[PDB]
C-alpha cells in the first residue's frame, strides 16, 4: 500500500 515512498528512498542509496 505504501510502495511508492520506497521508490524515492532507493534514490538516496549512496
Amino acid at each position, epitope marked *: 500500500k505504501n*510502495e511508492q515512498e520506497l521508490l524515492e528512498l*532507493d534514490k538516496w542509496a549512496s
Partner: antibody
Amino acid sequence: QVQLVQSGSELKKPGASVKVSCEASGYTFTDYAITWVRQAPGQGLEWMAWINTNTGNPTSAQGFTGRFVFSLGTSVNTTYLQIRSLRAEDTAVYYCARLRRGGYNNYYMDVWGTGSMVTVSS
Amino acid sequence: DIQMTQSPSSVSASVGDRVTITCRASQGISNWLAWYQQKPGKAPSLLIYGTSTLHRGVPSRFSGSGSGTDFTLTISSLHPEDVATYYCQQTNSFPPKWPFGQGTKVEIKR
C-alpha cells in the same frame, strides 16, 4: 477490471505540443506509481520516466527532461504526458504502465495501457 | 553509459523446442531483471520479475535465471501461442538508467 486507459492517436505538426492522458481503472490510482515507455515504429522499447502519483515529482532518463513534462491533474485517476517542440523522432507509440517495487533496483511493470500513437507531420 | 545486450536478435525453433534467450549488462546494475512479452499488434506484458518470479497467469514453461550481469530466459516447450518479441530490462534508481534489451523475435518452425 484492473486496466489503464490512454488517450487516442494524435497528429501534430513539428514544433507543436501533444498531451496524452492515462486513467487508472479497477484499482486505486494513488496506491501505485505510473511509468511511461516509448516505442518508435519498428523499434524496441525505451523507458522514459516514472511519476509519483501522490507527490507528482517525475524521474526521467537523460533524454526525456524539460522537453517532456509528466504531470498529475486535479483528477485523482489520471496522469499526463506532454511533448513540446514535437520533432520527427517523437513519432512513436507511448505506453502507460503501473510501476511495481520488488525491491531496490527490482522495478517491474505489471499492468500496461493500450498505448497512444503520436505522429508528427505538417 | 549502461545498456543491455540481448541475444539472439531472433530465433526460429520448432514446437516443443527449448528456447534460451540471454541478456548481458555492460555493467552491474543489480541482481534483479524483468522479462516482457510483446505479441504482434499488442502492448507488452510482464513475463518475469526479480529474475525468476513468474507473473501470475504466465505458464510454467517460462523460466528466469541469472545474477550479476548475465541473465537467461528459458522456454521449456515452444507453444504456438508463444509467438512474440521478448525484452529484458534492469532498473537503476539513483541514476535513472533503465536500459531495455534490444529484443528477441521468436518465430516457429512447422
